Amino acid sequence: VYRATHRLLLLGAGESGKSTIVKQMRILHVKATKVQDIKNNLKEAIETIVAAMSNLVPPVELANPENQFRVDYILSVMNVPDFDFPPEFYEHAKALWEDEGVRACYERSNEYQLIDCAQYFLDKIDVIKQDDYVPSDQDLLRCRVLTSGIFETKFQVDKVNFHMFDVGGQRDERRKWIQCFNDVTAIIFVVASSSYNMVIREDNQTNRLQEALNLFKSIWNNRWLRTISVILFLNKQDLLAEKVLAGKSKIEDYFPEFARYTTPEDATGEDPRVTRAKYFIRDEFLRISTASGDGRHYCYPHFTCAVDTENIRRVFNDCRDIIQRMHLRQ
Template structure:
């Protein structure tokens, strides 16, 4: 009889323990549901140097408080480093291959000579003195930058920057070298937007628009950074994929054999066709439209050299009519790249996701304000669909609580036991 009572007590205690555990799990799931429903989570993806971090900076300017005086001053060193990287520092340590304008002159085929022989002393200073790790940016450095930048040979080398690796902001900061070097220099918002700093890791930015909460995740786009992307996939509302259309004539820093736009196309394909992302729609930012326009109008780097089928491409007639006040060749180039990326997303492969393209210029605050306002309705619809689909919502919550992930470069996979 005593044994029977002990057995019943043990069963009762086990049942109570299981019941308590179930209640805790249910509470946790309800809490996660509430948190999920109240926040839109946006994941910024794209190849390196596509403009993802600049989009995040724009969210700070538009929807937070911008940058404080202290934060602006903290950016001075990074801006001056951008200027130095542009004019004098060559960084050839793999996987990053970066050359300055001065450093590239002799390596181009055919090589470029300085227009004024008296500027050789300034170029030597850049390559020998200013390239030292402990360089402290004396005032003469900025004076020399300004003088060298006006040299015809330096300008010619800059015009051939697709033949080597040069940061996009080179011209912007070289044009204002004397201002950047002034003792009382305080960066403007545009200076901060233009400043290039390599993103490594995952950065979260939180902001609200009309009482709606957004969490935006920015991750590095270089190949070795992509294994970190999967950590952000569990509960994302939408993916914002950023592609630099102006880089059609450039190669990757980490792989000089790969065209940058073709890398972006392959990367979007790997995301779009991934089985774990078939219910996540993509907002496509076709970025750096300002630089694309400059290249097309300059006429020196023909798109058909890198994408032969561009030679026979015709923009939709309604598009040409809508943009009739703009240069027709620029419009044709814009929509060629739009259509190239939309081809990648033309097959849903059984998924319930869509691609929404937008032409963007990440350094143009008004453009990003307008585009993001357009995107908010799309994001809201995606979020409501996720929250209204009990099966999908439960799957998201369970994956959020229990799944771990691994990733191989550019392609995504779950551990074997979860697959």
């Protein structure tokens, strides 16, 4: 029954949402440390905000001098990795978040590296002050954690067995992927879309999306993975939509071919720019696929949002039909 187990793996750059998509799929159908992770994600988010408040090359003003004491407090607790969760510091962080300077720094967070969930996590401070509420499914899927070792997850659907292979995206872990390049039914490629504007934290020069696209070119053209027909799940679509609707940043900041690009004919409340952005990233992946196509691997782009559920289930149903087709070796 080796074939009957549809084993498939996700490959992509760091913070592309693969672990989140695994968690969302798991809760869609098949603790104290989790709450700790919520708190720690909040801590690092606010820490990075206030560190880049001053470390940023263009200085940003502070709303009120009275919060300079809290800024010094957070600077003192910056180098400290101790797991401190005092209500006083929660009140301090609440005071900072209502300052216009901190909000402006968050809006200017595109210059440095910051976790994506921060904003949402920055609205959970009032209820995380109590530290007693049970986290919701949205809260669980908003949690941020790193993945280094490759992970396998059981799966069952329509009375058949699937296997999830979630691997790391950091360059240090890119050597481990060959450990699972064999006998895999399909590849579920996941690339963070809204992270087009970010850059990698491994080098601090190259864009996260550019690095992801180069990794996709490597994976698709790999001389050992030529009969597996990768399936594309571009995550991060909701943040991409809100970012383009914001208007502060656009794809032309990094890819003027988008400015030359025009909307395709396969368009599906909406706006032209967001639709053509998602379609353009899909079309760039498809261009890399077809230009390196060999007649055996086929790319089926499908737009995904990990935090969403209806989108998750719809795209997962489409992909499950695709995997059911490919299983028979048509």
